[PDB]
Amino acid sequence: IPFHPYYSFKDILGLTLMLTPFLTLALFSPNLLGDPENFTPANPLVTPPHIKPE
Amino acid sequence: ATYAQTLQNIPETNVTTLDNGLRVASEESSQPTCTVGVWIGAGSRYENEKNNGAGYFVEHLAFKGTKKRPCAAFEKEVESMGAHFNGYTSREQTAFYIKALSKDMPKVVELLADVVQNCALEESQIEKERGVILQELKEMDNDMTNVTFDYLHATAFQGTALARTVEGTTENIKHLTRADLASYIDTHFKAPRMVLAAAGGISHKELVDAARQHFSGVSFTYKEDAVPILPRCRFTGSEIRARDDALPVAHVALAVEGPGWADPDNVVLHVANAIIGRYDRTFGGGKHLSSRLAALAVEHKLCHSFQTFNTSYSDTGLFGFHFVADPLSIDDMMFCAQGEWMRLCTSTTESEVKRAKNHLRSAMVAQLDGTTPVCETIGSHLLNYGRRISLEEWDSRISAVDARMVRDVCSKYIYDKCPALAAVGPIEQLLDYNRIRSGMYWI
């Protein structure tokens, strides 16, 4: 089938379906995923307790 | 002598109703030969699921002789007078007509009446024409153009009376009975629904007299002389795709619902199709043809042929187009076509219509080129319009059409409408109803 409108439409739908949770998070629980340790300016004389990547 | 006058000077069409309700009409000319026949308001549409195809089976026996004079005799008697006997049957109209010298106008009329009123229906003949019709179906099955139009209806009027083929189902033809056929005739072939029309060197009176003489059968109850109105047929924007990459070319038909015989717009609609017109690889005009679609068709090798149409019916119709193309040029063709429909609705020119009109005028005039064609026009106008519309009139209605008018009507019938489409053959490149549906708006 032709991509348009079938998938152009289907993708635009899938865009809003995911975009909702993204925004919901980004806006209501902003730092839900970030380490609070990064609200402290880098300091070479204090190793954090648990250094782990994202 | 101006066209204007040559029109006024066209003799009138005489119409008189007998007592049983039959209408006799005719146009007298100075011609030694003529065409007389009965045009009936019957056909597949009037059929049902169980008798679909009867009217056609009947057509197949109408000539195989009557009770008063069997096959051999009937045939021999007609051939021997040099008369030609022909007839047909469509969805809403059936007809049997004869071509002979005016001198035999009455003996003809007799014959006609004997055919519609006393068909033999010889039990033995049926079983033979049954094998015959069955053969005709197989031959017609290989005529893509009619297989397509059938499918077009099949879906454009899906689920209704009009969605049936004139010839009928295979089963229906394998089992129809002497009874069912008889019944069809006795139920449908009736005076109030018939018209004895004729044209040539015939005297209306000599005709109407010979009419009263052989078309007797007077009706008793009120039911017998009121013409039954048919339940309506619902249009449906939809598509049917019968694919077969094995066929050499593809056939495509697209249409919106039509207005129906009585509606005046039909004139403008025809004026419109006159603009788009038609093409076919043997038109020498080639790239200079006036029809934009035809040109593109030529400039870009878009197709083998194409035709616009305005098939009308009592209460509905089909306004669209059909084209035959090669598997790989279906899309461009379709694309361009829908383009023109859009042009009609949004940007028609006075220049365009002016021409379309002349082409249309010449058309109506040519529709009456001989006696059979005239008789066919009389037999129809009455049956459909309830009277006769003379070239003098048609012309006035056509002359009144202007751009601003063509636009409005086409818009009213084409713009943003869900169309019915039927494709047959190697149709892979033509695709998606959705896409086609959107080609229904914005120039």
UniProtKB/Swiss-Prot annotation, chain A:
Indicate the transmembrane segments per the record: 9-29
The stretch of residues making up the signal peptide is none
**Localization in the cell:** Mitochondrion inner membrane
Subunit architecture: The cytochrome bc1 complex contains 11 subunits: 3 respiratory subunits (MT-CYB, CYC1 and UQCRFS1), 2 core proteins (UQCRC1 and UQCRC2) and 6 low-molecular weight proteins (UQCRH/QCR6, UQCRB/QCR7, UQCRQ/QCR8, UQCR10/QCR9, UQCR11/QCR10 and a cleavage product of UQCRFS1). This cytochrome bc1 complex then forms a dimer.
What does the record's miscellaneous section state? Answer: Heme 1 (or BL or b562) is low-potential and absorbs at about 562 nm, and heme 2 (or BH or b566) is high-potential and absorbs at about 566 nm.
What is this protein's function per UniProt?
Component of the ubiquinol-cytochrome c reductase complex (complex III or cytochrome b-c1 complex) that is part of the mitochondrial respiratory chain. The b-c1 complex mediates electron transfer from ubiquinol to cytochrome c. Contributes to the generation of a proton gradient across the mitochondrial membrane that is then used for ATP synthesis.
The entry's family comment says: Belongs to the cytochrome b family.
Protein name (database record): Cytochrome b
Query: Species name for this entry?
Result: Gallus gallus (Chicken)
Instruction: Describe which stretch of the whole protein the shown chain covers, with first residue, last residue and complete length.
Output: 219 to 272 of 380
